[PDB]
Design a protein around this ligand. Structure first.
Ligand SMILES: Cc1cc2nc3c(=O)[nH]c(=O)nc-3n(C[C@H](O)[C@H](O)[C@H](O)COP(=O)(O)OP(=O)(O)OC[C@H]3O[C@@H](n4cnc5c(N)ncnc54)[C@H](O)[C@@H]3O)c2cc1C
Ligand SMILES: NCCc1ccc(O)cc1
Length: 434
């Protein structure tokens, strides 16, 4: 009688884990679909990922599901060797993708400066603050200071030129899914630590390999294993911790509640008792994910890569599919969901016009996760101070919080973190039950 709130990857894998242990469960999902912020949907002639897209075999939890559900060889690399463009002091620079990669690689070396001392085990991100920490007190001081520094200032303080600063600004507008200047640099350093402290591996893990059959092949796979029907169109309005009340007034009694609703949507639920003050502050300030993901279709087959810094409508845009009607579908990430209408052709044209006054856009699409009352955010990213006093505070309770945003590893940004934390939270419930 464990109630799981939400049928995203975290709730689905938690349900399967409870099923293995013979523990009764039920998933309540607000929407008329499963998958959450992973959503494979036919748009503009093709199945497109409106949320989660890229995977890698160095992501333990994602890769095990890829193997489980038959997708081992069903991955394809995104287009590479694109003609690259980047905006720096208001002007467009042209170059090779290798040119751009080399600049980012140099900047990442400084950005990841401090990961080998903080993250010898990159899956123990708070080791420096633990009582097992046996390093110099100065490392702890630097760790805490880095939570209050954004990733771009690290590159500025190292003396890189404005062209590199503008590239890194663009890069982290996309990576921090919002305003990178409010972000915690420790997020970037942990990404380095999980990627052998090498830019190319980090890009290999986060932005290279796509699922031919979509994230839906994984989340429908997990759902297909479940012996208990998921209750769609059943939003939870109250959690007593247990008792769950739906929006319709149904009261469902529970032994435990696994809540996978993300921070951007937690204010839809009334908790009794109230959540700890430190958790409420995070919800009030949420996380670093105010941006948006667009899919743009242009005439012709063009191998294109574009970078632009804040406040551009989109900061990273890249060719992804070359369609059979002589069009190209490009993906884009931007820092501010309110400065772009993902479904307006003129706004998508304005994006492409950041770099090339040609390349007319014939179609565009996307889902604005931040304006979605059941998400309220894109992928979770960290504001200043939220590495050490943010994601880890949802472990207290009494009611359990699970989701990518609380993972120890590829937190927020990857399905790997949802599969990690959904599974380990189910183990917390399993361990408590006898
Ligand atoms: C634009 C974008 C691109 C991404 N790209 C990638 C990528 O390339 N690779 C990658 O690995 N990851 C990617 N991700 C991250 C990945 O999507 C997430 O890490 C993961 O899907 C989050 O899963 P979750 O189960 O923690 O949360 P969610 O998927 O948010 O699941 C929570 C569920 O709870 C439901 N819910 C909300 N409120 C209620 C309520 N009151 N009652 C009941 N149900 C409720 C929601 O509808 C949802 O189904 C991306 C995310 C975004 C936003
Ligand atoms: N949804 C996360 C996708 C992503 C990962 C890394 C990066 O630098 C930009 C985007």
């Amino acid at each position: 009688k464990v109630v799981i709130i939400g049928a995203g990857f975290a709730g689905l894998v938690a349900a399967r884990e409870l099923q293995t242990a013979g523990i009764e469960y039920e998933i309540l999902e607000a929407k008329d679909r499963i998958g959450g912020r992973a959503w494979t949907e036919e748009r503009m002639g093709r199945p497109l990922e409106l949320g989660a897209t890229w995977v890698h075999w160095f992501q333990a939890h994602t890769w095990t599901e890829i193997m489980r559900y038959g997708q081992r060889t069903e991955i394809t690399a995104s287009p590479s060797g694109n003609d690259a463009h980047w905006v720096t002091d208001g002007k467009v620079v042209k170059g090779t993708e290798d040119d751009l990669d080399e600049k980012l690689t140099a900047a990442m070396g400084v950005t990841y400066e401090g990961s080998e001392e903080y993250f010898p085990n990159p899956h123990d991100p708070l080791w420096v603050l633990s009582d097992d920490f046996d390093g110099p007190a100065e490392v702890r001081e630097r760790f805490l200071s880095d939570d209050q520094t954004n990733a771009i200032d690290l590159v500025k303080e190292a003396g890189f030129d404005q062209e590199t600063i503008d590239l890194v600004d663009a890069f982290w507008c996309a990576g921090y899914i919002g305003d990178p200047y409010t972000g915690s640099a420790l997020m970037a350093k942990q990404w380095g630590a999980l990627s052998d402290n090498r830019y190319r591996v980090m890009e290999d893990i986060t932005l290279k390999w796509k699922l031919n059959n979509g994230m839906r092949s994984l989340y429908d796979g997990i759902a297909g294993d479940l012996n208990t029907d998921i209750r769609l169109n059943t939003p939870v309005a109250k959690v007593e911790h247990a008792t769950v009340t739906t929006e319709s007034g149904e009261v469902i009694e529970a032994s435990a509640v696994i809540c996978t609703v993300p921070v951007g949507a937690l204010s839809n639920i009334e908790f009794s008792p109230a959540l700890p003050d430190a958790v409420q502050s995070v919800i009030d300030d949420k996380w670093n994910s105010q941006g948006a993901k667009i899919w743009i279709k242009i005439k012709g087959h063009h191998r294109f890569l574009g970078y632009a810094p804040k406040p551009a409508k989109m900061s990273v845009v890249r060719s992804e599919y070359f369609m059979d009607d002589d069009t190209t579908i490009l993906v884009g990430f931007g820092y501010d969901n309110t400065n772009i209408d993902l479904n307006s052709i003129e706004d998508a044209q304005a994006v492409i016009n950041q770099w090339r006054d040609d390349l007319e856009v014939v179609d565009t699409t996307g889902h604005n996760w931040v304006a979605d009352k059941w998400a309220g955010q894109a992928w979770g990213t960290l504001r200043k101070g939220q590495f050490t006093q943010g994601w880890s505070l949802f472990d207290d309770i009494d009611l359990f919080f699970a989701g990518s945003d609380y993972a120890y590893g590829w937190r927020g940004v990857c399905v790997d973190g949802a599969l990690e934390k959904g599974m380990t939270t189910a183990r917390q419930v399993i361990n408590s039950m006898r």
